[PDB]
Amino acid sequence: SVYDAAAQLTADVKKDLRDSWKVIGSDKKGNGVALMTTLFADNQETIGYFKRLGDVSQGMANDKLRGVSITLMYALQNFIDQLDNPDDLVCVVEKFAVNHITRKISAAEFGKMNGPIKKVLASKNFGDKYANAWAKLVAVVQAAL
Amino acid sequence: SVYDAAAQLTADVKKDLRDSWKVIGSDKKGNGVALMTTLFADNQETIGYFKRLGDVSQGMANDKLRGVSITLMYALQNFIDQLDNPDDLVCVVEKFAVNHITRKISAAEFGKMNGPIKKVLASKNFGDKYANAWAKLVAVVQAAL
C-alpha cells in the first residue's frame, strides 16, 4: 500500500534524496528535458502516451515538451519538500497518481522513469546509492497506481 | 495572446510578485489551504468542480483537499520561477491550462481566485499594490483558457 511504501523512506534514503536533488533540481529545465528525452529514447513505446506533445525528437525546441518537462521537475520538488511529513507526502502522491491513472499509466509503466533518473544522476556524479534512493521514492507513487 | 498577456508583466510587477511570494510561498500547505477554503467560502458554487475531494468543509484535515492545495502552490512556484523568460513562462502556462480546459473551467471562473489571493496577501500585510500584481499573473493564465 502507499502508506507502507512511504514508511520505506528511511533517514538515510531521505538524506540522499535531498543531497542529490540539491544538484539535480538546480536546473529544472535542462535536467527535466534530459529526463524526458532519455525516457523516449530508451523506451520508445511510451511515446504513444504523449501524442499531444507532437514531435518529441525536437527536444528543447518543442514548446509543449519543454512545458511538461519543467512542470515534471516541480512535482519532484513537491515530493522532496514533503519528506518531513509522511501524511503530506502521501496526500500529494495520491493527487499526483490520479492524473496518471486517468491516462491509464500502470505502476510498471511509471517505473520506466527509473532508467532516465539513474542516467541523469550518473551524469552528475551520483551513483547507484542515489539511483536506489530515487527508486524508493518512485515506488511510493507506483503503490498508488 | 498568452505572450501578449505576459507583456503586462513589467519589471515592477515581477518585483512585487517575487517579494510577496517570498513570504506567501514559505508556507505552501498553510497558504494553499487558505486559498482553497476562501475560494469555497466566497464562491460556494466553485465547489461543484471539486466533488472528488469529498467533504471540503473539513479543510486542512481533508487529505485530498490538502493534497490539491499544496500542489496548487507549486504551480505558482513554477510561474514565479519562470518570470524572467517569457518563452518558458508561456509553455508552462499553456501546459497548466490544458487540464483546466479539460475541466471546462472558463477564464471568468478561473478569475474567482483573485479574491482569495487578495485576502491571503492582506493577511501577511501585502496591500492592493501586490494584489494588482497577482491579478496580472492570473490574467496570463486566463489568456490561455
Ligand code: HEM
Ligand atoms: C518521475 C516520474 C514522473 C513524474 C514525477 C511525472 C510528472 C508529471 C506531471 C507533474 C505532469 C503534469 C501534470 C498533469 O498533466 O498531470 C505529468 C504529465 C503526464 N505524465 Fe507523468 N510523470 C512521471 C512519469 C511518467 C511516465 C513514465 C509516463 C508514461 C510512461 C507518464 C505519463 C504522463 C502523461 C501522458 C502526461 C500528460 C502530458 C501532457 O499531455 O501534457 N508520466 N507527469
Ligand code: HEM
Ligand atoms: C491561482 C489559481 C489556480 C492555480 C494555480 C491552480 C492550480 C492547480 C493545480 C496545480 C492543480 C493540480 C494539477 C491538475 O490536476 O491540473 C489543479 C487542479 C484543479 N484545479 Fe486548479 N488552480 C487554480 C484555480 C482553479 C479554479 C479557480 C478552479 C475552479 C473554479 C480550479 C479547478 C481545478 C480542479 C477541479 C482541479 C482538479 C482537482 C482534483 O480533483 O484533483 N482551479 N489546479
